[PDB]
Design a protein around this ligand. Structure first.
Ligand code: COH
Ligand code: COH
Ligand SMILES: *[C@@H]1O[C@H](CO)[C@@H](O[C@@H]2O[C@H](CO)[C@@H](O[C@H]3O[C@H](CO)[C@@H](O)[C@H](O)[C@@H]3O)[C@H](O)[C@H]2NC(C)=O)[C@H](O)[C@H]1NC(C)=O
Ligand SMILES: *[C@@H]1O[C@H](CO)[C@@H](O[C@@H]2O[C@H](CO)[C@@H](O)[C@H](O)[C@H]2NC(C)=O)[C@H](O)[C@H]1NC(C)=O
Ligand SMILES: *[C@@H]1O[C@H](CO)[C@@H](O[C@@H]2O[C@H](CO)[C@@H](O)[C@H](O)[C@H]2NC(C)=O)[C@H](O)[C@H]1NC(C)=O
Ligand SMILES: *[C@@H]1O[C@H](CO)[C@@H](O[C@@H]2O[C@H](CO)[C@@H](O)[C@H](O)[C@H]2NC(C)=O)[C@H](O)[C@H]1NC(C)=O
Ligand SMILES: CC/C=C\C/C=C\C/C=C\CCCCCCCC(=O)O
Ligand SMILES: CC/C=C\C/C=C\C/C=C\CCCCCCCC(=O)O
Ligand SMILES: CCCCCCCCO[C@@H]1O[C@H](CO)[C@@H](O)[C@H](O)[C@H]1O
Ligand SMILES: *[C@@H]1O[C@H](CO)[C@@H](O)[C@H](O)[C@H]1NC(C)=O
Ligand SMILES: *[C@@H]1O[C@H](CO)[C@@H](O)[C@H](O)[C@H]1NC(C)=O
Lengths: 551, 551
């Protein structure tokens, strides 16, 4: 078996076979040396005793509301802090990217082939003696047992942070531009070849789909008017392929950039809101530039919408998820004198950790109705019946589920939850503890320490035996949450570097792009820098209902 | 007409229309302000009073051999100087990239579509009153007339810097991995989607082509053995498409990563040398790693050859061209504490300036024979007849043509020389003087100042009327050379930023890749960091003949 199977190399050191049964660790720039990269250099030892733990940092950022209130009002100070949040998080991501499901060593194939998700840790080699390497039993516990014992919802557990359905649907719509598993090829492959925030879920992944969605007048997207309301055009009108089961009537097959977005009326609500936003931006641009043509109106609006998206995601979405009293800021200039790579490759494990199915409620409650999963799925009649204003007002009020803490996956999606476990193993993911060490976190020393509780911990001990072979995905969903929080530490500490990297990595954030003329002048540039989830709804939904990401 | 037609914004200010007959310049981070970005800030005023001209710096680099001898052997000084070279040149290149032939403003399409070459200057708008904007006549002079009066060789002008045919064929083999114009789509499009030094000219641009070239044993590339010598395998054996006339003997239809390389035996010489190098690195790695299979042997050799290529290009090829007494160094670590983007997009103008037609001799002299272009073209028999040893010995001794200085384009390639002019015009290139200002050079104030001479200057004055509409490509070939140099200022000052950017921008130069484990341990790493043009031939050509890029 591969001499690296036991993952001997510590502290981001890299393992290489040097014979059939010997390895060498490459400790370059890790700040450690010795056979396994565990002897700290003097200056490292100094950093290690002065580094606060992630839990300490969390405490600080979630208390002293009064101090943060002052901090938030000193632009100089707010910038300093926001800069440090960006730099520290991004240093954890390999960029240019390295490994993928087929390459546990760096290769040109893994670097150059955009069809793969990248990998933050290399796969476990095919010939290892146990699924996690050398530890644990020959087989991992039946995934149906893991799912049933510690993942499936008994009573609905509401998110104590107050996340609503506007938030759950925003997360689903936004992340589905960059998590687009290519099932013809397997779970380690993506169809999102732009690998980030390019708004392909609005404009289409390829030029051909974009051209069928565009009106070719005024920079606009095609649309239809139903009952005086603007909605996406149909499949029949556009020839844009969409995934619909065969019983969907032609007039109900809306066409949008992402072909799975007809699956869910919460996804279509966002699709329709963003299509309106693009056309509203074209209108403002045409007023600023009566000399411009359609192609430039269209491309400039798309750049403006990419900036609006990043800005909302940082200052509304991540803000709300963080629970911080510090006010996060979208400001590309904070990086202009730092070392930072303006590029991103989507990581398989970032896709895995975003499988937030416990966020889903037991029913979808719009106005006086409570729809089951079966009535909601595929059913865009519900959208037309109630209308966008009612959808916003209903979803803003309805609470989502807690994600960490265990037993909160709705039964309606049990096959999806089981697939995440199975596919993690097909992709030969290393263990939870290897992933915690990869992200500068202490390994968990027991199931009880992971869960913070006794009963789920004891079920997992019986299922897995050894904490060091506990798997990443189920651990994210059973992990002890922060006090009154939606997530536990592992979710935050992996999720935040992948997220900030992907947001800031965008070329629009680069110094040659981040200038008013990129966006058609100061008016277009202000649209980005003042965008918000409330303004997005206010500008594009009749009556301008109030909204946010909390109930 | 477009109000930016006259190129009103200076100092890398960006021009935008603000109504039908009005523009705004965006002076963001230029160090200038005012309507056209021409009023310098105080620090800018200071930094401009202190900056030496390129010709002063070139003079210092090519004199005081005595001092440079000292500097070359003080590793700390050498590194400090090489560091400054890398950083100051790279800063001129937009990265992430911006314009292309269809987009004279930033857009997602121009960012994301890898089929385009990028553009260092936006194209002249389609509706400008003259080819170059607003200056000059309604039509540029007939390209055949410019070609015949100032470009065509009367008698062969030797390169005074002593470049040889090893150098000339190395330039052509090396640059044709990244200049691969997609003539199906147009001159502003490329088939080299890796946009740099990925060695697709050895390994194939696509995975399907790579797999047909590979042996699948020991990491190796397929090959044949003719009269005891190793050569690339055939088109028949591999089913790899190559460009060859119908008459070529089956066994001379050599198949290599790049489809056009059977065109010229000097290109097949280097293809053959590099195929041998790949398989020799396979043998070294198999010895080091008997545990490794074919796939990892193949990928790790590729990474190693990519490193060897960068190494030789900087320390042999660019060293030679530069004329400097300072010893250039390939060392990724010099950029580790600098701001630098590990990515590259090939510029259309870098392709245009690399049209080094005048390097070609009047005949190709091997051993006793002197072959004409007609006899040399598509003729791999000559390679087999003389053998690689004789190739290297003859090409090392045969001098190449001078590139600048005018009238040195061999007539056998006059059609290609005329195409460079016609296609520059189709891609709506801005003028020489706009390019010189883009790269911080003073615009030429007369045709005489451009050429350093009278007769060509007078022909060009009558052809073009205004120096501000002289064209880039033909200016590079008539420009007054540096003293006994192969190139003028404009060639070196545009060429060096594009070159060093594409060299250092490669992911293998990034801190996560630049580690001995990437290359299979210390043995593979050393192969890279001790590569030269001499060791390349010594290891792979029977008898280990002396070679160099000069004499
Ligand atoms: C972001 C939070 C979130 C939410 C709220 C959510 C809500 C819902 C929902 C009700 C509206 C339904 C019916 C489903 C059903 C599914 N989900 Co999501 N999912 C979410 C995050 C994800 C992610 C991320 C993936 C992987 C997508 C991929 O890789 O293509 C996923 C995968 C799936 C798949 C697998 C098919 C595939 O194309 O990979 C199904 C089926 N699920 N989910
Ligand atoms: C670098 C030095 C160099 C040399 C020594 C050289 C030597 C030779 C040679 C010797 C046997 C022959 C027969 C030709 C003939 C040709 N050259 Co070159 N070329 C060179 C630099 C280039 C470049 C760069 C291009 C554009 C390549 C592309 O875009 O595909 C080119 C283009 C061409 C093309 C067609 C592609 C195009 O873009 O128009 C032909 C045909 N030529 N050339
Ligand atoms: C990168 O940009 C290239 C230049 O735009 C582009 O090539 C172009 O692709 C389009 C659309 O696929 C082809 O045009 C076709 O448009 C309609 C679509 O319904 C067809 O029915 C027409 O008959 C026509 O064939 C363009 O001809 C083609 N232009 C070229 C090759 O110069 C690439 O598609 C873009 N690449 C990517 C990844 O987007
Ligand atoms: C290097 O890390 C390795 C891999 O775990 C260590 O090797 C194991 O060490 C344990 C405890 O000392 C023993 O069971 C064996 O000696 C090792 N196992 C195997 C399979 O060899 C090693 O001791 C660490 N090396 C150093 C020098 O600290
Ligand atoms: C910016 O450049 C513009 C356009 O190139 C200048 O306009 C010219 O300036 C002077 C007028 O005194 C003349 O040389 C030209 O006849 C003018 N041409 C046009 C089209 O206006 C303008 O002055 C520059 N602005 C500044 C403030 O320097
Ligand atoms: C990226 O890698 C995938 C997986 O290797 C490649 O997909 C395969 O293409 C091969 C070789 O042409 C085929 O035999 C199979 O049809 C594909 N295998 C799959 C999908 O798993 C893909 O071609 C690569 N992309 C690029 C640009 O090279
Ligand atoms: C391409 C990826 C770009 C954006 C991804 C968007 C949202 C994901 C945000 C967080 C995932 C879980 C951790 C939450 C981050 C809050 C903590 C912090 O700001 O440090
Ligand atoms: C893809 C880009 C990578 C490599 C470029 C390859 C060759 C370029 C070399 C010459 C173009 C003219 C450059 C002369 C540079 C010498 C001066 C200097 O180093 O500053
Ligand atoms: C080498 C191909 C020459 C083709 C001749 C057509 C162009 C003639 O051009 C003339 O050539 C003369 C001879 O060198 C020069 O003295 C003139 O200045 C030049 O205009
Ligand atoms: C779809 O939802 C509508 C409400 O608009 C409901 O009346 C109908 O029964 C649903 N259809 C299905 C197939 O569940
Ligand atoms: C090709 O080269 C051979 C020598 O190897 C030469 O004698 C022959 O004439 C050439 N063929 C053509 C078509 O010129």
């Amino acid at each position: 078996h591969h001499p690296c199977c036991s993952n001997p190399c510590q502290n981001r050191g890299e393992c290489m076979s040097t014979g059939f049964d010997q390895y060498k660790c490459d400790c370059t720039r890790t700040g450690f040396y010795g056979e396994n990269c565990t002897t700290p250099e003097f200056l490292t030892r100094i950093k290690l005793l002065l580094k606060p733990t992630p839990n300490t940092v969390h405490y600080i950022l979630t208390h002293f509301k009064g101090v943060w209130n002052i901090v938030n009002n000193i632009p100089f100070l707010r910038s300093l802090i926001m800069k440090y949040v960006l730099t520290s998080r991004s240093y954890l991501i390999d960029s240019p990217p390295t490994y993928n499901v087929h390459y546990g060593y760096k290769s040109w194939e893994a670097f150059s082939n955009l069809s793969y998700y990248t990998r933050a840790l290399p796969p476990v080699a095919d010939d290892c003696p146990t699924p996690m390497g050398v530890k644990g039993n020959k087989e991992l516990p039946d995934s149906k047992e893991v799912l049933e014992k510690v993942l499936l919802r008994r009573e609905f557990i509401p998110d104590p942070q107050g996340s609503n359905m506007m938030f759950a649907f925003f997360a689903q719509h936004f992340t589905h531009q960059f998590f687009k598993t290519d099932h013809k090829r397997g779970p380690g492959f993506t169809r999102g070849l732009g690998h980030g925030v390019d708004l392909n879920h609005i404009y289409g992944e390829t030029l051909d789909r974009q051209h069928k969605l565009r009106l070719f007048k005024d920079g606009k997207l095609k649309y239809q008017v139903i009952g005086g309301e603007v909605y996406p055009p149909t499949v029949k009108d556009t020839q844009v392929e969409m995934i619909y089961p065969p019983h969907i009537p032609e007039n109900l097959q809306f066409a949008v950039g992402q072909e799975v977005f007809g699956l869910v009326p919460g996804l279509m609500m966002y699709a329709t809101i963003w299509l309106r936003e693009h056309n509203r931006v074209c209108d403002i641009l045409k007023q600023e530039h009566p000399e411009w043509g359609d192609e430039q109106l269209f491309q400039t609006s798309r750049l403006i919408l990419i900036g609006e998206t990043i800005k909302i995601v940082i200052e509304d979405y991540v803000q709300h998820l963080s629970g911080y009293h510090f006010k996060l800021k979208f400001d590309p200039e904070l990086l202009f004198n730092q070392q930072f790579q303006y590029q991103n490759r989507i990581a398989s494990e970032f896709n895995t950790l975003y499988h937030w199915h416990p966020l889903l409620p037991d029913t979808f409650n719009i106005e006086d109705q409570e729809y089951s999963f079966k009535q909601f799925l595929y059913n865009n009649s519900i959208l037309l019946e109630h209308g966008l204003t009612q959808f916003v007002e209903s979803f803003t009020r309805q609470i989502a589920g807690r994600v960490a803490g265990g037993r909160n996956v709705p039964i309606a999606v049990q096959a999806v939850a089981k697939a995440s476990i199975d596919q993690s193993r097909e992709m030969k993911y290393q263990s939870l503890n290897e992933y915690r060490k990869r992200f500068s976190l202490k390994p968990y020393t027991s199931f009880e320490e992971l869960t913070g509780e006794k009963e789920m911990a004891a079920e997992l001990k019986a299922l897995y035996s050894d904490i060091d072979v506990m798997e990443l995905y189920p651990a994210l969903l059973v992990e002890k949450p922060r006090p009154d929080a939606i997530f536990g530490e592992t979710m935050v500490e992996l999720g935040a570097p992948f997220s900030l990297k992907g947001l800031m990595g965008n070329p629009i954030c680069s110094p040659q792009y981040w200038k008013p003329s990129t966006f058609g002048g100061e008016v277009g540039f202000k649209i980005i820098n003042t965008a918000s989830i409330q303004s997005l709804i206010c500008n594009n939904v009749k009556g301008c209902p109030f909204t946010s990401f909390n109930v």
